[PDB]
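Re: the multi-chain job from yesterday

Posting the exact lines I submitted so nobody has to dig through the queue logs.
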Amino acid sequence: MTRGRVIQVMGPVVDVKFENGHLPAIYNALKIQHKARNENEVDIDLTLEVALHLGDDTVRTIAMASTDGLIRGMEVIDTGAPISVPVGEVTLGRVFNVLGEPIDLEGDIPADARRDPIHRPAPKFEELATEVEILETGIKVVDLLAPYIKGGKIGLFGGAGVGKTVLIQELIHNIAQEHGGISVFAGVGERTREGNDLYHEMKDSGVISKTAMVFGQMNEPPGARMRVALTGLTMAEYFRDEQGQDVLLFIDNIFRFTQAGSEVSALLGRMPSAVGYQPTLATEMGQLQERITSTAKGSITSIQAIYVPADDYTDPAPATTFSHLDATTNLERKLAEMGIYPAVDPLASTSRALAPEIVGEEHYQVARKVQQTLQRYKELQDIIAILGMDELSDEDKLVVHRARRIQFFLSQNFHVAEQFTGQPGSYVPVKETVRGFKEILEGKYDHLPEDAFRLVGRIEEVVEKAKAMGV
Amino acid sequence: MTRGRVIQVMGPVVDVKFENGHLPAIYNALKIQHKARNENEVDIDLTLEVALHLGDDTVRTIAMASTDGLIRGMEVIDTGAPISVPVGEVTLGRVFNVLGEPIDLEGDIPADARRDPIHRPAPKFEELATEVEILETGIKVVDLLAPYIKGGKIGLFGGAGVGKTVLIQELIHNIAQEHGGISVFAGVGERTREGNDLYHEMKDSGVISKTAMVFGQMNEPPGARMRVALTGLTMAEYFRDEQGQDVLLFIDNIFRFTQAGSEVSALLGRMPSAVGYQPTLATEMGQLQERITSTAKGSITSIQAIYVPADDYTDPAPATTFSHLDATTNLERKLAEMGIYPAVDPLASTSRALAPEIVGEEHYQVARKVQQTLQRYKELQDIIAILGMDELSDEDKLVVHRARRIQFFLSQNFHVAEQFTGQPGSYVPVKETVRGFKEILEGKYDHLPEDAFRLVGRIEEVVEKAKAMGV
Amino acid sequence: QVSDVGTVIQVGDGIARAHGLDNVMSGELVEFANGVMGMALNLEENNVGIVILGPYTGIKEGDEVRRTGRIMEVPVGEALIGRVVNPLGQPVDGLGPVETTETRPIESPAPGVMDRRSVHEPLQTGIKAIDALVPIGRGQRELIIGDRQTGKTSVAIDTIINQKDQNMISIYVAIGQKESTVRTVVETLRKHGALDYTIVVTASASQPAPLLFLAPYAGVAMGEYFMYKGKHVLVVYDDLSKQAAAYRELSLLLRRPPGREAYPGDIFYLHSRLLERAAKLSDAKGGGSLTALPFVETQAGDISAYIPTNVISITDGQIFLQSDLFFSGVRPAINAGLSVSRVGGAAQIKAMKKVAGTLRLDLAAYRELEAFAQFGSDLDKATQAKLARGARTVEVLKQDLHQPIPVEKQVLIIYALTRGFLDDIPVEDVRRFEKEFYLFLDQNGQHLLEHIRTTKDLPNEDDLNKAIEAFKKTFVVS
Ligand SMILES: Nc1ncnc2c1ncn2[C@@H]1O[C@H](COP(=O)(O)OP(=O)(O)OP(=O)(O)O)[C@@H](O)[C@H]1O
Ligand SMILES: Nc1ncnc2c1ncn2[C@@H]1O[C@H](COP(=O)(O)OP(=O)(O)OP(=O)(O)O)[C@@H](O)[C@H]1O
Ligand SMILES: Nc1ncnc2c1ncn2[C@@H]1O[C@H](COP(=O)(O)OP(=O)(O)OP(=O)(O)O)[C@@H](O)[C@H]1O
Ligand SMILES: [Mg+2]
Ligand SMILES: [Mg+2]
Ligand SMILES: [Mg+2]
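And the result, C-alpha cells for all chains:
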C-alpha cells in the first residue's frame, strides 16, 4: 500500500519511508492528517513536497507549513500528483495562498473545478515570439533611457528602502487600470501590511474584478515562499495559453524565492556554494524564469522587483538574474539620499528597446547625449570631491552645469507618492520628455536655478516654479 | 611477478589494489596495456605513478594521460622503478614528452640506451659552488640594474600578457647562439602554438642541433604538467654531472608545476591550505628547485618564467618562489599599458651581482642614482595628478623632467619584437648603456623630446630619431 | 539482446547513484528505463556516479540503468548547417531530423606540437578597431571580455555576418541564455543571410547543468569534423563563465571538495582542454584551421577574478570592452591599452601592416599622455600635436552596429588618417569625412580598391596622395 511513515524531522525538512516499489516521484505532494490521541499530542494538517530520493525506500521532503508537533511514525499519504491549484475564471477577484486555497473569506472553490499541476516544463524554442514593442509608462527616466517592452520581462533592482514597492505601485496605477487584459499579482516574502493595503486599494479602484492575487509573505515557512511564485505563474499561464490574452504579472520580490531555496538547501544535504548559497542556484532560477515568457498563443509581460542584499550588486542572486531580463532599472541609495526620487541609475539601467529603429532617431540621439554628459559628470566628480569646481576648465564647468540640471529633471512626482509629500503626481508623455531633454541639452534653460528642476513633470512646470521662486 | 587491479577511478586519480607483501614503492611507475575484448571497450596504453599507500594493500596513483576508457578490474603491471628517460647525446636535437618518448617523428630511441630515474635527492652542501660572475645579455635594464649570474638562478615574474615569453625568446636568441655548451628547454604548461613557434625558430637558426626540448602543455593532464619539469631537469643533470658541460636550462612556466600539483591534492585527500594550495607547497617547490644548482663538477644557469596570478605578488606560489633565486626580474603591467617594453620594474628587480666589487664602482653608482631618481619620481605622481605640475618646485620639476626621460630610455627594441614593432632589434653593451644613462643623469639631453627615447637602443639612435621630428 | 544492467540508489538535482554496472567504462553513455541518457563520471569501489543528460523527474530509486558501450559522442556532418540543435545533436527548431551518418568523441586529444603551423592568414571581422589594433588570424583563439551590455554579442554577430563571402563555417554556442534571446540571434542571422553556413548550439537556463557543461565540447567536436577535412571553422562560446558555474554545480553535487569560491580544482584544466583544440593544422594534416572566440563576463570591471584570470592565461589575446568608454560615445568600446593580440602583424594584410604597424602603441601612449598634461597647460607643441593626432585616431575608430567595412577601404582610411591628411580637419567632422571618402573611392577610386584587393600591398603613394588631395579639395568642412 502507498502509506509512509515519518522518520526524521529537521525543521522544514521531513524524511518519509515508503514500502518497496511504491516510492512517490519527485515533486509529488504528500499529506499528513493526524488527530491527537491523548493530551500529549496535537492535531496536524500538513502537506509536503518530494525533493530527493535518499535510497533504502526513503524520501526527503520539504514542508509547506510549520512542522511543530510532528512525531516519528506518523502516517503519510501520497496524492500521486504534484500540487494542483484552481485555474480559470473562478480565480479572478480572489486571493489565494501557496496551496491554492482562498483566504479572502468569500467561500471555498467547488471540488469539481479544473486545477493544474504546479510543475511543468518550459515552452520550447519554436513556440516563442520575439516581437519588440514599446510600452509607455509615463515615467520620464524609464521612457527616455530604458523603455519597457510589451510582452517582455522587466526587473527593478534596489536595496532596502529605496523605492521598489513605490515604483511597482506607480506602474500598476499607470498601466494596470487601462491594460484591458488579465492582471496577476504574486507577492513573495513581503509585508502582509503591504499585501492588505494593495488588496484594499484594488478593491476600491475596481480593478479587482479582473485580477488574481497569491500571497506567501515573510511570516511563512521557506517551502511556501518557494512555491507561491510557481502558483501565481501557473495561474497566469492558464490565461496565456487557454485563452490567448495579454497578462500582467507582478512579482513583489523574486529574490525571496532564492533566499528560501538557500535556507532549505543546507538541511537537504548539499555542500554550500561560494557565498553560502545553494549549488543549484542557477538552474532553480532558470527553470522558473523560462516559464515566464510570451508565446504565439498569447503574451505575458512581467514586472519583477529584485532585492539586492547589503547593497551588493555582485551578490550571486542579483548577479544571475540580469541575463533573464529584457529591461532593467537600477535604484541607488546615493540617488535617493539626495532626494532624486525615482532613484533610477541613468547609466546602469539598460533596455533592448533603445534602438534607433524602435524609438526613433531623435529619441536615440537625445538619450545618447544625456548618457554622455552624465558619464562626463561622473568622471569629474572625483576632482570636484577634493578641490571643488574652481579648477575645472570652461568646458567641464558647462558639462557640470548641464549635468546637474539633467539629473534633477530626471526626477518626477508620483501619484502614489502623494501620501508622503502632499503634492499631486504627474504623467509625462514620451514626446514631451524628449522635447524637454532636447531643450535642456541645447542650453535653453541654463539661467534657471537647478532647484527648480526637482519633482516636476513637463518642462513648463520648471519655468512655472522658477517664476514662483525668485527669478 | 605480481599484478594489481583497478578498483576505483576518480578523474585523474586511480586506485589500484595489489597482493599482500608486493606493494610498489612510492614514485614507481605502473602500466596499463588493456586490449579491447569486444566492441564495448577501447584499447588503453596508460602510465601511472604511485603517490600514496592507503592501507589494505591499496595504492593511490596519478595518471600521466587521460583516464577515459578505464574499467574497474583492469590488470596493472608494476615496473619496479620510477619513470626513466633517455640521457646523453641521443637527446640532442630531439623533442620529448613527459615519458621520454620522442614526438618529433624522427624515430624511436633504441631500447638499450641509458635511462635515468626521474626522482633523485638534491646535491649536498659540500659540493656546491658559489663563485659569482656576470652574464651579459644585451638588454639595457637587465645589464644595468639587475645583472644575471653565470651558473646562477634567474626568475622572471609577471602577470598575464606582460612579456615573459618574449623576454625568454630574446634571451635565448642572445645567449644560446653563442653559449657553446648544451641547452635544455622545458615547456611546462603553456601554449602549444608557442612551443611550435619556438621549435621552428630554433630549427631555422640551427641551435636545434645543440639543444633538447621537452613539452607538457595546457592540454595535458596534471601528472604530465607536474613531471615534465623533472624530466627536463634530469636531462640537464646528466650533462652537468657526467660531462661537466655548461648547461642553459629554460623553463617555460614554473608556476604550472605548482598549479598542477594543487589541482589533485583534494582528490589525493589532503585538507586545503590558505589560498586553496596543497599543504606541501613549500616542500614540493624546494624539492624541485634545489636540484637546479651549480656544483664543482659542472654549472647550470637556469632562467625560469614565473606566473603571478592576478598581478598579486603576495600570492603564495611567487612568495615561496622568491627565496630560491639569485637574480630577479619583475614585470609590471603598469609599464605595459604605457607602451614601455620589456616593461621591467626598475626598483623591484634585484640581483646578488649588483655590488661594487662585482660590477664596478661607476656602474654601481650610476645604477643607484637611477634608482633614487625613479623612487623620487614615483612619489611626485600622486600630488601631480591633483595639483598639477605648476605647483611643483624647480627641483622637483627637473626631477620629473629627467625621470621621464630615464624611464623612456629604459625601453628597448628586441629582435623577436619585429612582429609587433616593424622596426628591427638591437644589441646594447653594458658599457654603452652605462655611459648613456650617465649622460642622461648629467642632463646632456634635457632639450630632447621625451618621445625620442621610445624603443631606441643607444642614445645615438635617440638623437638620430629626434632629427625625424625636426628637433 | 543482452546488456550489463544496474540499479538506481539515489536520485536528485540531476545526479544519480547506481549499484552494479561492473564493466562500465569511465565516461561511457548510459540510458535509463524511460529513455533519458546519462554519463558516468565517478567510478567508485561499489557504486557509480551518473550525471543525467535530461529531465530527471521520471527517474525513481530502483529503476534500471543500461550500458550503451559508447564513449560520449555527438553527431557530426554537413546536415547540421543551418540548424539549431541540442548539445546532444537533436534539433530544436522543429524542421525535422538531421541526417548525420557520422559521430565524434566529445573528449579528444588536441593536435600536437608537430601537427601545427604558425598562424599566417587574417580573419576579417569587418570592424576597423579589431582589424587594425587587435588582429585575429585563422587558428587563433581571441578572448572577448567585458561587463554586461558592452557589445560582446554584437561583435561576434558582426564577425559571423562578415564571413558571408569568405569560405568559412561558423558555429555559435550559447550557454545559459534565454531561448528568446537565442531566437532573436537566429532571426538576425537569418535576416543577414549568415544562416546558410552557420550551426548554432543552444543550452538554455532551464536545461540541466550537464548540458551547459557539455555544450562547448559538443560545438568544438562539431567544428573538428570540418577542420580535419581541410575546411576553416569559426567557433563562438558566448559565455564560458556560465559553463564554469554549471561545472561547479555538478562538482558540488557529486560531493567533490570545493576550492576557491567553491570552484573545483580542475576549473583551469577544463578551459585549457576546451581551448587547446583550436589550432592551425600543418600542410601534412590538411591545412585546415579552427578559430575560437570565448566570452568572459566580469563583475564591475574586476579583472583579477578567478575565471577571468584563468581564461586570460590561456587565450592568445583579449579584447576589453568598458562601460565608461561605451557611454562616452566611443563604440565599440575597445580599450586599446589593455587589448592585445599575440599574433598581431602576421595575421594582417600587407597594406594594413604598413598603415597600422604602430597604432596600438600609439593609442596607449596617447592615453598615457592625456591623463598627464590634463592638470597642466599642454605647453609643448609636440604634446599639442600628439594629442591632436590621438583625438583624430579615436574619432576615426568609431563604428556603427551592423555596418561592416571592407579591408581595402579600411587600409585607405587608416592611410589617410596616419599620413597627416586629417591634421587640417576638425574632430567633429572626420566621421562624415570618412563616410564621404568611401563614396568618393566608390565613384573615382575603383582602381586603387582593385589593386589592394588583388595584390595585398599598397599602391604607389603618388596616385593615392593625388586621390586624397582631390577628395580634400571636393570636401567642405562644416
Ligand atoms: N517616488 C517617491 N517619492 C517620495 N518618497 C519615495 C518615493 N519612492 C520611495 N520613497 C520613500 O522611500 C520609502 C521606501 O520605499 P519602498 O517601500 O518602495 O522601498 P523598497 O525598495 O520596497 O523597500 P523594502 O526593502 O523595505 O521593501 C518610502 O516610504 C518613501 O519614504
Ligand atoms: N618587447 C616587446 N616588444 C613589443 N611588444 C611586446 C614586447 N613584449 C611584449 N609585447 C607584446 O605583449 C604581448 C605579451 O605576450 P607574451 O606571450 O610575451 O606574454 P607573457 O607575459 O609571457 O604571458 P603568458 O605566457 O602568461 O601568456 C606580446 O604578444 C606583444 O604583443
Ligand atoms: N557599435 C555599437 N553602436 C551602437 N550600439 C551598439 C554597438 N554595439 C552594441 N550596441 C548596443 O549595445 C547594447 C548591448 O549590446 P550586446 O547585448 O551585444 O552586449 P553584451 O555584452 O553581449 O550583453 P549581455 O550582457 O546582455 O549579454 C545593445 O542594445 C546593442 O544594440
Ligand atoms: Mg518593498
Ligand atoms: Mg607567455
Ligand atoms: Mg550577450
